[PDB]
Amino acid sequence: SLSELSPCHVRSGRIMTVDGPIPSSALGHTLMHEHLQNDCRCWWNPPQEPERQYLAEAPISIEILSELRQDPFVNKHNIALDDLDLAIAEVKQFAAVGGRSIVDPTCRGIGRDPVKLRRISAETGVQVVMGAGYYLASSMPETAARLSADDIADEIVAEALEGTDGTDARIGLIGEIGVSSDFTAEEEKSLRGAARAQVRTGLPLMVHLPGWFRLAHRVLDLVEEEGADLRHTVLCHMNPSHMDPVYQATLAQRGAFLEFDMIGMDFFYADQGVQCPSDDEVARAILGLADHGYLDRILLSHDVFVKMMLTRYGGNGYAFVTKHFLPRLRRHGLDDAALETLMVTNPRRVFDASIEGH
Amino acid sequence: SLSELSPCHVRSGRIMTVDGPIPSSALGHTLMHEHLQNDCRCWWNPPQEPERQYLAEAPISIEILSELRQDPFVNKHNIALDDLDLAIAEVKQFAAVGGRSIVDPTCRGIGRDPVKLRRISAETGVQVVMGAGYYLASSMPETAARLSADDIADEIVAEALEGTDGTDARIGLIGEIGVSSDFTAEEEKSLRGAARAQVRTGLPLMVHLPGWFRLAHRVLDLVEEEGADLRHTVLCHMNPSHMDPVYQATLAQRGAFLEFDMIGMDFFYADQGVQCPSDDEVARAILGLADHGYLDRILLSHDVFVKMMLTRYGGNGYAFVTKHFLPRLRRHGLDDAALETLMVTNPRRVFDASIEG
Amino acid sequence: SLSELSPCHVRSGRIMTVDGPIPSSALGHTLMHEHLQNDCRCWWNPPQEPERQYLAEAPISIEILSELRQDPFVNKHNIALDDLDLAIAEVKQFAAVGGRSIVDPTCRGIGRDPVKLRRISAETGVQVVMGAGYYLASSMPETAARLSADDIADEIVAEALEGTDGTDARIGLIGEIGVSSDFTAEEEKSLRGAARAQVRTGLPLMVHLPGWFRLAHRVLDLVEEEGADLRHTVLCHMNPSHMDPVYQATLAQRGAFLEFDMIGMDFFYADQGVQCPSDDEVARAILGLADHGYLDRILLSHDVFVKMMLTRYGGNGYAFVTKHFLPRLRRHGLDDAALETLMVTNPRRVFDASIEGH
């Protein structure tokens, strides 16, 4: 009969960062979905072609970038953000263009580390909000199998109230819960646990979608069924469904945030046989959603999750959305006020339910 | 006329390479539009902000590739393909995947050099066809002002029959004739001279178009009134108008080749404020044209023209179309017969009028 | 204090017809929006060109139908359904093809008459449901100016519980509430009173939209803030917005019924300068709405409201949707189950909240 709400629940007016609560007004210019450190080794796509073996063991170098872009998971070096010093330098680029906060949804199974997040936040001066929960079935630890939906919910609640991974750092978002195109029983159990935790903690809920598929409405049905708040639920990886305006708009209508977290990402995922859309295509979709009154549901990010996405390795880094995509949205007809809404007001809205709509 | 026809005119069944004539059947798997060596200094886009000054004088390195992709012309090192050894290595990648010939439309003003082409063909074993004529106005030498359209046609005729740039290497195509969005009086004179040379030499004609505009029909009107053969006229840079199927299909109907020579190029040209389309968007356009029966008018290439487009500098190289785009077209529905038509039959059709449609 | 619910509220399982309550299961094959008798003289479009003067005064004859189709409101004889015997014969055609019920939304200002409706239901054997409330501004009674939103709600509640126009006939639907492209303060007051009546009586709410505009979301916003049930709110005249799938789908997602009540109407309204879409264009829009999972929100009717729409005058009559449009929907891809859903299940859903969705 005790309340389990986070001291930084959506009706508190505060946000839980790895360094403690901050007023929602201090969030400022924000990147809603970025990985600062992680481990994607489980997604390694072994080259079966004899001609393509050199791509697996070699460290990222300028001469192999083209091939990596057509199959980023083929390279072992690429699939792990484990360079803290580089992470710090790359994040400083964001801070250099006004960046103030970063939401890191790296959860259980893919390298979440509060100790490392605090080091980055302290050295960069950029505020960091940490996520929680379980990812895709393949990344789930041996122990998850014995856990019930409520057991998973309990773990999340504890991280929002007590601490995480043996530290007193607490989460500020229940996030990047894995839902694959197969939407396995494990994943459903995981999502139900996250949704129940959303109700118990009052924290925003972020769900990883299989972007090239269309399970978003089924995802929201489940969240809604568990009693969670759709207006504080974020649907990740919307970029690939840019050509389905009805799909995207009806989702926004239900209240969920539509996160276009793949800005700048243009890879072809050989494994899945899917292509990331262009920024122009995404820009038009965003323009369409805004024209239909859903501007306050749109979120932008890069979803940096591999080394080749850092500028040091030829990538766009964490300052690309701010430096290059915003000007592109301008070219598509969006005004300054809209840009402020996208990078500042909407992120705040995800965490603060008292913020008026658009 | 007759005496001025190239030994390899479009009704000869032969093709003129920098190393001499070859039967059209020997052309094989081809890239219709690539620059092996060139000079694009005249297009350098000086960095306005003193904060981007480093992007101008610094050499290309993996750490600045993102910025360069948003403004390729800001970097001086990037705007000139001048390393022959690298050109040779990059071209071998194409040969390694079945590549047999490359058409280099580098013409006057942008660094055409028959000696270097011959070295590349010698060391790679890849057949090279050399272009000719004048490019965009800003690249034209001061001596071009004195030339009449006929004088320009005469120069082209001489390179088709006797030699080029002080060598005995003869051209096998007229082109990458520059037409800017402004279509200046000089560019018009240049194009008329090219069209007249097309009639006189009987060689294919290739025209550079400002891809983000829609001047193609005006271009064909002029080529046609000058008496040139539209069925052996190639319209370059069609990638940007992928969203205008009527425009593209009507051009194909008139008989011209639609060259999607920007496969793999995804830069944002800041100077002009235009964006290169994605390969998926281009693939859909190609499928559409084929659905309407215009498959025999489609050509593919990369238009490699700056350093960052080579694999050595993080780019796609000359083997990308073959290795990665053909599979993409396969994913879109084109069968193997169609891929053979695109990389072998069509290129042959450009140079040989006897190939059935 | 004390309940004001109609004996046939949406959770009653019954429906109020001019002849009393009937189980919702008895509604059957239904036309959700038809006028059996009405008066549209206040919408006459006088021909400025003296050459077209003859069309204004002349009676409807086969010789001038072409001209009338290009400007229906030019003819005085056309803008009033006043022949009860013809109405009865025309309605018998609907019954002749399986029709069981008709919903007549003719309200105050446009000729609502419970006496006539009863004679029609009596002689045709077709069940008739009567609407209520006020229509567009220009048709509103002088007295409506003094009425407050609550007074309007009170009038509607009285017709749902006691009787209407001096009779004991009670209403079964609240509506064909007028909302013009101008959405005047009076129309807003009218709609607010209607929505309050929806909450108090529990009866369905039907709203007239200026189809060629996009005010539907603003309409639902108002019905929503007044506490009314969007799930039993019908948005009329959706046909003209067939080319705006995002707009239509997002309205359906909010829960409102999308009424394509202009089936068969292909006139050009000279006055407004608007053109009625073709049945093929509408069929495609309907297919799309269904493809997106909104089939249970789709309603179909003719909105017969002028003499020229009756078969006697060369028009389609009341049996057109059933005899000709359903087959067209089949040619487009809909099966008999879907057709059954459109003409029976959905109409029942309008009046009965116990009907399962999907």
Next chain:
Amino acid sequence: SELSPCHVRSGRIMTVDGPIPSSALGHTLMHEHLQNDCRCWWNPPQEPERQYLAEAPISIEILSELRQDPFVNKHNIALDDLDLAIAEVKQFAAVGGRSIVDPTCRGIGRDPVKLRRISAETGVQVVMGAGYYLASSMPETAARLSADDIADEIVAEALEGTDGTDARIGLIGEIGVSSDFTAEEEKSLRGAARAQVRTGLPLMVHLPGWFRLAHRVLDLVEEEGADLRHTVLCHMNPSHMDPVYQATLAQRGAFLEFDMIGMDFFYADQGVQCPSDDEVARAILGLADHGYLDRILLSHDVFVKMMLTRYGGNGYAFVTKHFLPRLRRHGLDDAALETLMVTNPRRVFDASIEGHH
């Protein structure tokens, strides 16, 4: 030696009342039937509940049903009321109409005697067509006829007379091509095409509007050596949603005739629906936007009694009185309306008229 005295390069047009300079054609309807017989398309109702729609004369109370199955009514499928035809045509002259091209040919009731009565009484100039229509309407005698025999007949009607009169044809046309494109219809079309070469008159071809046989039709016509720039493709209305199909046909040089303006019936016998005027207007705008305004023709194809104002139809003045205003609402200016109703019809019959909007 077989050119009509009013061939397309003569500057003249052959009407049923003799030659007239092309400049005299004026405001014209390119495809209308003044008198005809469509009894062969009788679509009798096999259900008792629709038996009344068969032998009953058209009346106001059955119009809805007829619009859903035009051929179900006997009275409706024959324009045999000359007095009514005159009255209806006068409506067209009343709004500026000067000429009407009647493509009614062999098999569907062509009658020079009746056309002359109509022209004399209304003051409207009439151009008469020729050739054979759809397979199901060809006479038994056409079976033995070879393509050349068919062309011979057309030539005689162009130079000597028609059906025993001295009235001569001014257009070869409304040649029948069904969705099946039968052997007999192909022979008919080849004969028409050869006659186009011999007489130099324009060629008009009936197309199964809901299909896509136009390019195949133009292929045949072209190989028979006929003039594509004076070939008219009828019934383009139904392919309005295929801008590439329509634009490419226009690029080949043929006229695109939207002769079903105002026609909104559902042909139960074919299971096809006539498009709305708004949809057609959009298609016309698109073609003009891509520079094909000079290839666009408009008409009603009045061919059954219910299409006459007396029977609730639109009559022969609808295009002029109601569709032009619709085109204006869509964005076309007055000069474009002049181009559509006067200049283009003249272009059909006169090759000396230069192109453009």
